[PDB]
Scaffold this active site. Structure first.
Site, PDB file in Angstrom:
ATOM      1  N   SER A 242     -49.861 -20.660  13.482  1.00  0.00           N
ATOM      2  CA  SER A 242     -48.537 -21.310  13.246  1.00  0.00           C
ATOM      3  C   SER A 242     -48.431 -21.867  11.786  1.00  0.00           C
ATOM      4  O   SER A 242     -47.336 -22.008  11.278  1.00  0.00           O
ATOM      5  CB  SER A 242     -48.238 -22.507  14.277  1.00  0.00           C
ATOM      6  OG  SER A 242     -48.061 -22.107  15.651  1.00  0.00           O
TER       7      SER A 242
HETATM    8  C1  LIG Z   1     -49.210 -21.797  16.383  1.00  0.00           C
HETATM    9  O1  LIG Z   1     -50.272 -21.925  15.811  1.00  0.00           O
HETATM   10  C2  LIG Z   1     -49.233 -21.331  17.844  1.00  0.00           C
HETATM   11  N1  LIG Z   1     -50.611 -20.878  18.316  1.00  0.00           N
HETATM   12  C3  LIG Z   1     -50.924 -19.659  18.967  1.00  0.00           C
HETATM   13  O2  LIG Z   1     -50.035 -18.864  19.214  1.00  0.00           O
HETATM   14  C4  LIG Z   1     -52.321 -19.153  19.374  1.00  0.00           C
HETATM   15  N2  LIG Z   1     -52.828 -19.648  20.483  1.00  0.00           N
HETATM   16  O3  LIG Z   1     -52.109 -20.533  21.234  1.00  0.00           O
HETATM   17  C5  LIG Z   1     -52.888 -21.625  21.786  1.00  0.00           C
HETATM   18  C6  LIG Z   1     -52.972 -18.161  18.376  1.00  0.00           C
HETATM   19  C7  LIG Z   1     -52.392 -17.693  17.225  1.00  0.00           C
HETATM   20  S1  LIG Z   1     -53.523 -16.585  16.380  1.00  0.00           S
HETATM   21  C8  LIG Z   1     -54.814 -16.818  17.679  1.00  0.00           C
HETATM   22  N3  LIG Z   1     -56.078 -16.187  17.654  1.00  0.00           N
HETATM   23  N4  LIG Z   1     -54.327 -17.663  18.603  1.00  0.00           N
HETATM   24  C9  LIG Z   1     -48.623 -22.506  18.738  1.00  0.00           C
HETATM   25  N5  LIG Z   1     -48.900 -23.692  17.991  1.00  0.00           N
HETATM   26  C10 LIG Z   1     -49.171 -24.868  18.350  1.00  0.00           C
HETATM   27  C11 LIG Z   1     -49.648 -25.864  17.248  1.00  0.00           C
HETATM   28  O4  LIG Z   1     -50.665 -26.410  17.629  1.00  0.00           O
HETATM   29  O5  LIG Z   1     -48.944 -25.921  16.247  1.00  0.00           O
HETATM   30  C12 LIG Z   1     -48.779 -25.483  19.657  1.00  0.00           C
HETATM   31  C13 LIG Z   1     -48.113 -26.628  19.905  1.00  0.00           C
HETATM   32  C14 LIG Z   1     -49.319 -24.565  20.691  1.00  0.00           C
HETATM   33  S2  LIG Z   1     -49.495 -22.783  20.289  1.00  0.00           S
END
Ligand SMILES: *C(=O)[C@@H](NC(=O)/C(=N\OC)c1csc(N)n1)[C@@H]1N=C(C(=O)O)C(=C)CS1
Length: 500
Positions: A242
């Protein structure tokens, strides 16, 4: 019928304020001429005892080297023990003053400063990267030695030894100490495996702090853990997730097709592309504005924008801001990571790129990209040395777009349902949280402050926290807040959270 050497003084390394970080310390080296030692075997046991070496093994060594004219006895001693050995008056023993590094800040800057090998040559960190600058040039002496190999006379100096040159790093030891302490505590509070924290000056490109955990004492090179010696901010690649979404958003606003007040339908929190399913963690949204997409970290929302504008615009932003790009720092072991590229981008790569899956960056790269965004879209070259004359920057993001995104990242921190733990009391802060799924997670937060006129960019990466909290906004956001809070007061930045 000799040519002996004159060690050069290795150049001083300081922080940006002149605090010594690596200092050459005089040591005494003792060598011997076995041809003379063979005439004084009765003195060897006293010499052996004073050197530590075993009596019989040392005697065996000399007997084995009787025909040589030069051999080393010992290379690192204090001039206190060196004078004590010299007072024995053993025939054939000579001394040479060399230098060994001492690192006054030890573990605090072990990864950035690095260290030197047995030959006083740079092996890691700044010591290696700037070895040419630091090493200086050894000189060549000439001396008259007779058939016995006894130095009889001094005939000439063939080359004058030139000391290395001083180098001031960009690191601010005050900021380095703070980041080190807070990152260590955060790792312990979260039971995490490893971590990195970088602080950069957005106006000059200077890396003000770069710390990793675990760390080590470079004065204790008792052959510690090689894994612990990893300068993670530069050599470990990770998927940024993100935290890269503000660059995807920047491409959207620069495309002419999107404005922050525009709405995206993210229902039902999932999006199908053939066999691949994009998923949001929170799936209780329908219409979200662009700021809302960043606040809620909606992968679906960022994907829909990416399909509308095309991955080419997003790739161009992430590349120009340095994600997966050579930093120009010239650190031999530093990692570039990887930025996927395509001529015609399929849907899955467009979405995953926009939400940072399948991309590889470094914490320094991620920080530099946030520094450019914070610096109204101007990318200032990275520097590990104090910058007095700032090089020209490259406008990578239009000032209007970067300013708009800054405001959006400020709402991420300040708005309802945002990452309130990244708030920096007294200042307006901006940033973006990240959580990457490797049952093990990596918690990220990247941001900058003060939002009214950004001064500092920061990236916090905590690897595999093992306690209850695992979200970037839970694990890494408080670290950003704590370190950012201290760094702004240490740099005497005026608080910008003022009344209207
Ligand atoms: C942003 O970072 C996004 N995260 C994800 O999509 C992933 N896993 O979810 C838990 C991911 C991306 S690449 C990989 N190997 N895994 C959403 N962002 C957040 C944050 O913490 O900003 C949330 C509130 C939950 S998931």
């Amino acid at each position: 019928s000799r040519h002996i050497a004159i060690p050069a003084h290795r150049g001083l390394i300081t922080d940006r304020n002149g605090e010594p970080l690596a200092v050459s310390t005089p040591v005494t080296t003792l060598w011997a001429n076995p041809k003379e030692l063979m005439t004084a075997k009765e003195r060897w046991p006293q010499l052996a005892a004073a050197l530590g070496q075993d009596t019989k093994l040392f005697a065996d060594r000399i007997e084995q080297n009787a025909e040589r004219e030069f051999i080393y006895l010992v290379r690192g001693l204090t001039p206190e023990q060196g004078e004590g050995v010299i007072a024995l008056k053993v025939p054939g023993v000579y001394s040479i003053e060399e230098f060994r590094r001492f690192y006054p800040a030890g573990e605090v800057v072990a990864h950035a400063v690095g260290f030197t090998d047995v030959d006083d040559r740079g092996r890691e960190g700044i010591e290696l990267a700037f070895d040419e600058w630091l090493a200086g040039v050894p000189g060549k002496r000439q001396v008259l030695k007779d058939r016995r190999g006894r130095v009889i006379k001094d005939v000439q100096v063939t080359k004058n030894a030139k000391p290395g040159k001083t180098l001031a790093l960009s690191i601010d030891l005050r900021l380095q100490y703070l980041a080190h302490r807070e990152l260590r505590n955060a790792l312990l509070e979260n039971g995490a495996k490893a971590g990195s924290l970088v602080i950069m000056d957005v106006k000059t490109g200077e890396i003000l702090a770069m710390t990793n955990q675990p760390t080590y004492n470079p004065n204790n090179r008792r052959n510690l853990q090689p894994a612990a010696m990893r300068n993670r901010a530069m050599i470990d690649v990770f998927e940024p997730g993100s935290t890269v979404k503000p660059f995807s958003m920047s491409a959207a606003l620069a495309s002419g097709r999107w404005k922050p007040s525009d709405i995206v339908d993210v229902y039902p929190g999932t999006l199908q592309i053939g066999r691949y399913t994009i998923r949001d963690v929170s799936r209780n949204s329908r219409q979200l504005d662009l700021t809302g997409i960043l606040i809620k970290s909606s992968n679906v929302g960022i994907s829909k924008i990416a399909f509308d504008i095309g991955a080419e615009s997003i790739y161009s932003v992430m590349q120009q801001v340095g994600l997966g790009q050579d930093t120009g720092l010239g650190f031999p072991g530093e990692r570039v990571g990887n930025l996927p590229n395509h001529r015609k981008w399929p849907k899955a790569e467009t979405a995953t790129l926009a939400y940072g899956y399948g991309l590889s960056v470094t914490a320094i790269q991620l920080a530099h990209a946030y520094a450019a965004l914070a610096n109204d879209g101007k990318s200032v070259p990275l520097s590990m040395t104090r910058v007095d004359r700032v090089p020209d920057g490259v406008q990578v993001i239009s000032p209007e777009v970067a300013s708009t995104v800054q405001g959006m990242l400020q709402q991420v921190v300040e708005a309802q349902g945002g990452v309130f733990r990244a708030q920096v009391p007294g200042y307006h802060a901006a940033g973006k949280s990240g959580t990457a799924r490797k049952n093990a997670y990596r918690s990220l937060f990247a941001g900058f402050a003060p939002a009214t006129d950004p001064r500092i960019a920061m990236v916090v990466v905590i690897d595999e926290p093992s306690k209850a909290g695992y979200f970037g906004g839970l694990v890494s956001a408080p670290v950003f807040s704590k370190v950012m809070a201290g760094a702004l007061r240490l740099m005497n930045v005026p608080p910008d959270n003022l009344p209207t």
